[PDB]
Design a protein around this ligand. Structure first.
Ligand code: COA
Ligand code: COA
Lengths: 405, 395
């Protein structure tokens, strides 16, 4: 345990700066001890998505574009997605279902209170699994690329959960698809540098912020709409787990963010009067794959560990940005076909939930490992990596150590 | 691959020993000077609201009460003529504001960063973390990415983008920097706070008088700091140790200060009771930050040095009165409010810079006005208070 009340960890009686620092910092590695997930109620099957999307956006007359989009939908390897809207809800907003009519205000009115609400649902489940009082949460890391406001989404989530007035909040806005890795990076330093600290990480996304009508000259926008789904993932992270009360699963050993040079125009999103405008180059799977190995070598060398000769020796939580990203990263690292199974299962059942996807995969991995009676939460293996990929191109590389079952 | 018993050894080697310390401060502002005495004339002319005589009389009075002498902006009257939508009240303007703020904020921030890194004296290759802060403009990839790119930092610098945290954000960056520097051996954190207020500029309205109050206060500016634990003797210049950092939300006060990003840009809302909410709850935040580190709060608040966010003259007046402080205690804050206005997240950095510069010039015992302990305070939307406990070092 943290030993907050122990003599060895007590604060100095005199105003000793270094003595305060020694008492204030935690001892061990930041550890994931609970994972909760949530999604909105409306089920959108991928086999009928081309029909639903083209009908809802008054685009069924674009016959050749529909056939092209139906092909893309089959190639996504997504079976279903969840949204906070149905066809009836979209009829109230003809501006959102158009291509470029003014729509930010309406999207903000939905996303500003909606994202913290969805995130709170995942947080309640994470707090329940953890089992300790919500008043003992000292840090809140909220993450979303859907909606911005002052006071921010972290404030709203804290209010809905009824967290202490003195909770240290962090609002990670618009960090896209790498954000699920960014939250682990934040949580690591926050938990490790503060004795007794328990960090609640919340990643929540409502993709209606980027929904619009398909366009022939902006084909990449429709491709993004075939991938993005709504969802929320929440995690409780803390150093020095209390034996018999908390359940330590994954230790966050090293966390580094890397930018791939000369690739700013590969994945970029802009918040305009028409909402979030998405742009994607055909070169994203190959750009990520050609640079992922260098990111892994960096994360291992930064902690003095010799990079494994075989990448199959590790467990993996890669962000399912697209099926081709998963396929090409797998091929470059010479990984066996089942190494990314947890990621492919989540992509199938939930789609690309932006920052929430990796939390869902980490949940799937630990649940399947326990269900099969494996040795550790990380597929029976000791070391692994969580990867976030997004705008920049930016790669978040999170080195994890799994504890035994 | 190492064993289960080796994970703690990795953690021991990875963490820093001492307290996060401010070792360099750099500041920057755009070139266009707008004196406060003539602001009523300039603002009402640029927004074509010269027919609203009764509202101009009220605005001129507010400008005289602000205790701001001048402000700096990235625009002049000629620049504003190219954007009639920004100078109106509710015409669509977000796209144009984003086109200015998205590349402009990291550009201004980089200018301040260059000055901070130059003072620090070590190679830019030694910067391991970047904390960028702004309430003006949002984009993917974010302002942190753009700043790192402009400075030409390493590809693997850990970046933190603090978007839309308002006037308390200058305190938030110190809170972030503390944990980043202290939990990582050899880590050097570059903190950058930059704001371009054109994101909230609009025409005055009688039904929205609180927006006019905001336009009389906000000015453009940037502040940058280098923060790190375990200062290198003879190379680095350690100034302020970040001992304790706490964020507090004052309950039932969400409607006091709130801003919304709409199709018309940033819409500002302010209740007339903001100085009261801040002043009546500030002492409790101070007792809390001292108790958190086991230090008995001083019986006299004049025993500490102060870096309060100059949200407005009345906020400074009421906090001064509640803490029973002598007029010279907020000297650094009042000089910055006068010379630069309210630069949002950048203001506290400017005050900390002014404090250490004047302390060095007067030959005082420490960088914190010759005193040992002090507090940096951020106040903003929520109402949220960022309380940063600092221990200053000798010259
Ligand atoms: C979208 C995806 C699932 C389609 O699978 P696929 O195996 O590449 O399918 P196909 O090769 O049959 O191609 C489908 C059509 O889309 C095109 N396409 C794919 N990505 C495209 C993009 N970003 N922009 C424009 N066209 C694109 C191909 O050019 C092709 O059509 P064409 O023959 O008319 O030239 C796959 O490309 C992918 O996973 N991309 C990564 C997506 C991503 O980047 N996600 C993260 C961004 S936040
Ligand atoms: C704006 C300020 C400098 C004016 O100084 P002041 O000493 O209070 O001036 P006065 O009392 O003479 O008042 C000026 C007029 O503005 C009014 N006023 C002040 N703040 C107001 C607000 N937020 N909304 C509407 N009216 C406001 C008074 O009601 C008064 O007019 P009245 O006679 O019609 O009733 C001062 O109120 C202040 O510093 N407020 C805090 C500013 C702030 O909130 N900053 C944070 C922005 S996030």
């Amino acid at each position: 345990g943290p030993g907050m009340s122990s003599l060895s960890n007590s604060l100095p009686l005199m105003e000793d700066v270094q003595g305060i620092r020694k008492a204030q910092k935690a001892d061990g590695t930041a550890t994931v001890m609970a994972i909760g997930t949530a999604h909105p109620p409306h089920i959108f099957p991928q086999d009928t998505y081309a029909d639903v999307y083209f009908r809802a956006t008054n685009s069924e007359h674009k016959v050749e574009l529909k056939k092209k989009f139906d092909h893309i939908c089959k190639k996504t390897m997504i079976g279903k997605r969840y949204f906070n809207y149905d066809e009836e809800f979209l009829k109230k907003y003809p501006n959102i279902t158009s291509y470029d009519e003014p729509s930010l205000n309406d999207r903000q009115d939905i996303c500003v209170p909606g994202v913290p609400a969805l995130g709170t649902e995942a947080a309640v489940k994470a707090i329940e699994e953890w089992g300790r009082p919500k008043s003992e949460i000292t840090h809140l890391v909220f993450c979303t690329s859907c909606g911005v406001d002052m006071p921010s989404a972290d404030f709203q989530c804290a209010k809905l959960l009824g967290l202490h007035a003195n909770v240290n909040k962090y609002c990670i806005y618009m960090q896209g698809c790498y954000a699920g890795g960014t939250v682990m990076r934040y949580a690591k330093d926050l938990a490790e540098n503060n004795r007794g600290a328990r960090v609640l990480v919340v990643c929540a996304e409502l993709t209606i912020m980027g929904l619009r009508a398909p366009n022939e000259t902006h084909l990449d926008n429709a491709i993004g709409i075939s991938l993005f789904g709504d969802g929320a993932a929440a995690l409780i992270i803390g150093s020095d787990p209390i034996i018999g009360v908390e359940k330590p699963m994954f230790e966050i050993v090293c966390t580094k963010q890397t930018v791939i040079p000369n690739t700013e125009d590969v994945i970029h999103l802009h918040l305009r009067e028409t909402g979030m405008m998405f742009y994607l180059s055909k070169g994203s799977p190959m750009t990520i794959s050609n640079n992922v190995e260098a990111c892994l070598i960096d994360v291992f060398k930064s902690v003095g560990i010799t990079p494994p000769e075989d990448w199959n020796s590790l467990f993996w939580i890669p962000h399912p940005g697209g099926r081709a990203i998963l396929d090409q990263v797998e091929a470059k690292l010479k990984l066996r076909p089942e190494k990314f199974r947890a990621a492919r299962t989540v992509l199938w059942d939930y789609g690309n939930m932006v920052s929430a996807s990796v939390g869902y995969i980490l949940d799937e991995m630990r649940r399947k490992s326990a269900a099969k009676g494996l040795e550790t939460y990380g597929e029976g293996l000791e070391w692994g990596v969580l990867l976030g990929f997004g705008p920049g191109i930016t790669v978040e590389t999170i080195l994890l150590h799994s504890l035994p079952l």
